[PDB]
Design an enzyme around this catalytic site. Structure first.
Site, short mmCIF file in Angstrom:
data_model
loop_
_atom_site.label_atom_id
_atom_site.label_comp_id
_atom_site.label_asym_id
_atom_site.label_seq_id
_atom_site.Cartn_x
_atom_site.Cartn_y
_atom_site.Cartn_z
N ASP A 131 0.82 -1.21 0.00
CA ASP A 131 0.00 0.00 0.00
C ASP A 131 0.86 1.27 0.00
OD1 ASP A 131 -2.06 -2.10 1.47
OD2 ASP A 131 -3.14 -0.57 0.33
N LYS A 133 2.04 4.65 -0.84
CA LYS A 133 1.49 5.90 -1.36
C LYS A 133 2.20 7.09 -0.70
CE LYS A 133 -2.99 4.76 -0.45
NZ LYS A 133 -3.27 3.45 0.23
N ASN A 136 1.81 7.56 2.86
CA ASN A 136 2.56 6.63 3.71
C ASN A 136 4.07 6.91 3.77
OD1 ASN A 136 0.39 5.13 4.64
ND2 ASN A 136 0.50 3.63 2.98
N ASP A 148 3.99 2.05 8.52
CA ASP A 148 3.12 0.86 8.48
C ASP A 148 3.62 -0.25 7.56
OD1 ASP A 148 0.19 3.03 8.61
OD2 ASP A 148 1.63 2.46 10.16
N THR A 167 -5.97 4.39 -3.12
CA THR A 167 -5.39 3.08 -3.38
C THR A 167 -5.31 2.80 -4.89
OG1 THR A 167 -6.04 2.11 -1.23
CG2 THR A 167 -5.78 0.57 -3.05
#
Length: 265
Positions: A131, A133, A136, A148, A167
């Site tokens: 995930d 991005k 993040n 994370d 997403t």
């Protein structure tokens, strides 16, 4: 009050803001008095019914250590939720994209090299983000840290309209078809890199559906005027990272060592 191992060890200072997994809190240790960023995750969001399996994944993540990877200190339990105790840090790379609109090849290279360094290190340990991005990636002076990392295999995220569109931009084609390996992190980083330079998604659309249809085809272009004076090397890197088949896609080490990254390091 039948409080857990968390409440005896920590007590919340303030709310830090909603995250991808639940509420994010600023907590102080009751003994050492150091401050941490704690993610409260509802136990129903657990992907594995066997909790011990999850505690083992996290344990492996606690042992890991890399300058560009947010540190995960411990995992604690309530009756209702998990508590991921991690590094406290201060804004997202996403906020920087809004501010600068575009990045120079030099500035982009320094940022994404650090991203590659982190990915490489985690991939050596078989840990896939899934995930990746700009939301993040955290930044202020120069230092980037990916948050994370590895948590998405343990815990289910928020999937509201806002979550799903975000997403959709970065997801690799295989992940839609129902499989993933390390190569989906390289795809996602490629999309990010494409955005750093152009300020535009390689795979675009006014809704979740439209974006996902373009991802599915894997077709994108360097046709925007913004690309006219960007280097062949930068385009080469992105091409190798946005390679359709994951097996034919370049590794994270190959990203870290692409001639384009070396020119600005």
């Amino acid at each position: 009050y039948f409080q857990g191992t968390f409440a005896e060890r920590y007590n919340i200072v303030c709310m830090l803001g909603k995250g991808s997994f639940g509420e994010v809190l600023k907590c102080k240790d009751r003994i050492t008095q150091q401050e941490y960023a704690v993610k409260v995750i509802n136990k129903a969001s657990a992907k594995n019914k066997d909790t011990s399996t999850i505690l083992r994944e996290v344990e492996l993540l606690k042992k890991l250590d890399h300058p560009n990877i947010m540190k995960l200190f411990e995992i604690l339990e309530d009756s209702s939720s998990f508590y991921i105790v991690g590094e406290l840090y201060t804004g997202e790379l996403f906020d920087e994209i809004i501010k600068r609109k575009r990045f120079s090849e030099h500035d982009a290279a320094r940022i994404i090299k650090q991203v590659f360094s982190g990915i490489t290190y985690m991939h050596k340990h078989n840990i896939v983000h899934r995930d990746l991005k700009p939301e993040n990636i955290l930044l202020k002076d120069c230092d980037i840290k990916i948050i994370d990392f590895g948590l998405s295999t343990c815990f289910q995220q928020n999937t509201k309209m806002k979550d799903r569109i975000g997403t959709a931009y970065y997801i690799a084609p295989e992940v839609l078809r129902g499989t993933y390996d390390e190569k989906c992190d390289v795809w996602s980083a490629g999309v990010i890199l494409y955005i750093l330079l152009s300020g535009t998604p390689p795979f675009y659309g006014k809704n979740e559906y439209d974006i996902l249809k373009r991802v599915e085809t894997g077709k994108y272009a360097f046709d925007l005027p913004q690309w006219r004076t960007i280097s062949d090397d930068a385009k080469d890197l992105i091409r190798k990272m946005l390679t359709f088949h994951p097996s034919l896609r370049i590794t994270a080490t190959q990203c870290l060592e692409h001639p384009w990254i070396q020119k600005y390091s």
